[PDB]
Design an enzyme around this catalytic site. Sequence first.
Site, PDB file in Angstrom:
ATOM      1  N   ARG A   1      95.233  49.869 -31.273  1.00 34.66           N
ATOM      2  CA  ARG A   1      95.032  48.434 -31.597  1.00 34.66           C
ATOM      3  C   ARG A   1      93.555  48.240 -31.933  1.00 34.66           C
ATOM      4  O   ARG A   1      92.672  48.255 -31.056  1.00 34.66           O
ATOM      5  CB  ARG A   1      95.430  47.533 -30.427  1.00 34.66           C
ATOM      6  CG  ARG A   1      96.908  47.690 -30.080  1.00 34.66           C
ATOM      7  CD  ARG A   1      97.194  47.274 -28.658  1.00 34.66           C
ATOM      8  NE  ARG A   1      97.149  45.805 -28.510  1.00 34.66           N
ATOM      9  CZ  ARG A   1      97.745  45.148 -27.487  1.00 34.66           C
ATOM     10  NH1 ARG A   1      98.382  45.822 -26.531  1.00 34.66           N
ATOM     11  NH2 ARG A   1      97.716  43.813 -27.431  1.00 34.66           N
TER      12      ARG A   1
ATOM     13  N   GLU B   1      93.673  40.196 -33.087  1.00 36.17           N
ATOM     14  CA  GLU B   1      95.072  39.827 -32.794  1.00 36.17           C
ATOM     15  C   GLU B   1      95.209  38.333 -32.665  1.00 36.17           C
ATOM     16  O   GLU B   1      94.283  37.652 -32.223  1.00 36.17           O
ATOM     17  CB  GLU B   1      95.488  40.448 -31.448  1.00 36.17           C
ATOM     18  CG  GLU B   1      95.454  41.976 -31.588  1.00 36.17           C
ATOM     19  CD  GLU B   1      95.888  42.739 -30.348  1.00 36.17           C
ATOM     20  OE1 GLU B   1      96.134  42.138 -29.271  1.00 36.17           O
ATOM     21  OE2 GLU B   1      95.947  43.989 -30.486  1.00 36.17           O
TER      22      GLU B   1
ATOM     23  N   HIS C   1      97.344  35.562 -30.774  1.00 39.44           N
ATOM     24  CA  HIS C   1      98.158  35.405 -29.561  1.00 39.44           C
ATOM     25  C   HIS C   1      98.420  33.953 -29.216  1.00 39.44           C
ATOM     26  O   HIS C   1      97.673  33.066 -29.627  1.00 39.44           O
ATOM     27  CB  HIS C   1      97.414  36.061 -28.408  1.00 39.44           C
ATOM     28  CG  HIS C   1      97.466  37.552 -28.473  1.00 39.44           C
ATOM     29  ND1 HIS C   1      98.641  38.258 -28.265  1.00 39.44           N
ATOM     30  CD2 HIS C   1      96.505  38.469 -28.744  1.00 39.44           C
ATOM     31  CE1 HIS C   1      98.397  39.557 -28.434  1.00 39.44           C
ATOM     32  NE2 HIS C   1      97.112  39.714 -28.724  1.00 39.44           N
ATOM     33  N   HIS C   2      99.517  33.718 -28.484  1.00 41.60           N
ATOM     34  CA  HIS C   2      99.837  32.341 -28.091  1.00 41.60           C
ATOM     35  C   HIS C   2      99.260  32.061 -26.738  1.00 41.60           C
ATOM     36  O   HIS C   2      99.398  32.850 -25.791  1.00 41.60           O
ATOM     37  CB  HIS C   2     101.361  32.162 -28.098  1.00 41.60           C
ATOM     38  CG  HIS C   2     101.924  32.255 -29.471  1.00 41.60           C
ATOM     39  ND1 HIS C   2     102.269  33.474 -30.046  1.00 41.60           N
ATOM     40  CD2 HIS C   2     102.098  31.316 -30.431  1.00 41.60           C
ATOM     41  CE1 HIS C   2     102.714  33.252 -31.271  1.00 41.60           C
ATOM     42  NE2 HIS C   2     102.624  31.955 -31.532  1.00 41.60           N
TER      43      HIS C   2
ATOM     44  N   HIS D   1      95.419  39.441 -20.159  1.00 46.92           N
ATOM     45  CA  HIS D   1      96.776  39.713 -19.708  1.00 46.92           C
ATOM     46  C   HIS D   1      96.802  40.323 -18.324  1.00 46.92           C
ATOM     47  O   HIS D   1      97.686  40.014 -17.490  1.00 46.92           O
ATOM     48  CB  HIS D   1      97.405  40.708 -20.650  1.00 46.92           C
ATOM     49  CG  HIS D   1      98.772  41.143 -20.225  1.00 46.92           C
ATOM     50  ND1 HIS D   1      99.851  40.296 -20.270  1.00 46.92           N
ATOM     51  CD2 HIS D   1      99.229  42.316 -19.722  1.00 46.92           C
ATOM     52  CE1 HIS D   1     100.926  40.934 -19.844  1.00 46.92           C
ATOM     53  NE2 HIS D   1     100.573  42.157 -19.489  1.00 46.92           N
TER      54      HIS D   1
ATOM     55  N   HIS E   1      92.225  40.521 -25.219  1.00 48.30           N
ATOM     56  CA  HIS E   1      93.617  40.204 -24.895  1.00 48.30           C
ATOM     57  C   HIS E   1      94.125  40.928 -23.650  1.00 48.30           C
ATOM     58  O   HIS E   1      94.817  40.341 -22.793  1.00 48.30           O
ATOM     59  CB  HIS E   1      94.558  40.582 -26.027  1.00 48.30           C
ATOM     60  CG  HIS E   1      95.964  40.285 -25.667  1.00 48.30           C
ATOM     61  ND1 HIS E   1      96.925  41.252 -25.413  1.00 48.30           N
ATOM     62  CD2 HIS E   1      96.565  39.095 -25.457  1.00 48.30           C
ATOM     63  CE1 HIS E   1      98.056  40.650 -25.061  1.00 48.30           C
ATOM     64  NE2 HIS E   1      97.858  39.346 -25.079  1.00 48.30           N
TER      65      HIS E   1
ATOM     66  N   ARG F   1     109.699  34.007 -32.576  1.00 48.45           N
ATOM     67  CA  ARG F   1     108.654  34.521 -33.498  1.00 48.45           C
ATOM     68  C   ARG F   1     109.249  35.220 -34.719  1.00 48.45           C
ATOM     69  O   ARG F   1     108.564  35.433 -35.705  1.00 48.45           O
ATOM     70  CB  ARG F   1     107.643  35.388 -32.728  1.00 48.45           C
ATOM     71  CG  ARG F   1     108.193  36.655 -32.222  1.00 48.45           C
ATOM     72  CD  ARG F   1     107.095  37.609 -31.656  1.00 48.45           C
ATOM     73  NE  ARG F   1     106.293  37.027 -30.600  1.00 48.45           N
ATOM     74  CZ  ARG F   1     104.963  36.825 -30.617  1.00 48.45           C
ATOM     75  NH1 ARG F   1     104.161  37.133 -31.651  1.00 48.45           N
ATOM     76  NH2 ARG F   1     104.430  36.288 -29.551  1.00 48.45           N
TER      77      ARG F   1
END
Lengths: 84, 134
Positions: free
Chosen positions: B96, B100, B102-103, B131, B127, B5
């Site tokens: 946060r 976002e 994200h992959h 997770h 997210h 990244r």
Amino acid sequence: MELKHSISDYTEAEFLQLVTTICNADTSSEEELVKLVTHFEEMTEHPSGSDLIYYPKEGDDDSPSGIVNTVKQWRAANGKSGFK
Amino acid sequence: MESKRNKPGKATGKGKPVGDKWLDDAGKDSGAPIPDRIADKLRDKEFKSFDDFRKAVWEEVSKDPELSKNLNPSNKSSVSKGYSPATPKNQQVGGRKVYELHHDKPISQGGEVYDMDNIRVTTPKRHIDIHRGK
């Protein structure tokens, strides 16, 4: 670590400048902007947090002077300290 | 290990059609896809890092009338600068406070960094929920 920011250290003018910086995103970086939004939330003590700026209630004026007036009135209604 | 990244790469992929309420989907399911019109603008361009790509995504959002129409004036100012727009308070996690990227397939498991079909837009809360279930 950083102690809570207090709104009564700001004059209304100073607070209007801070809110305008946020609304315009007049910062050097996204990180600096989110830091200012955090400080705004700490100062207002308003449970809606950053929504005052980004997700205003129907009927609320979300211009900088609009947001300042919403904060001022809410603090007044809830027995909190006002501006310097 | 060296971080992929943080190395340059070339954006690829198609994205998906979305509506003017696309960012609401960012707090549900696996988040929102990259909009097809954003993929169309960025595809085949080289970026210096994933952070540079992320700025380009929000710059492109600011330029697209349908994808930015739902943002309020303060969020329009943010994306005009290439910053990510703020999510509703109820979707934030601590400091946060913004959407976002994200992959979906982790880069460590074969996912590509700049493959726009492998990137999802999520709120911080969504997210973290994803997770935590892994």
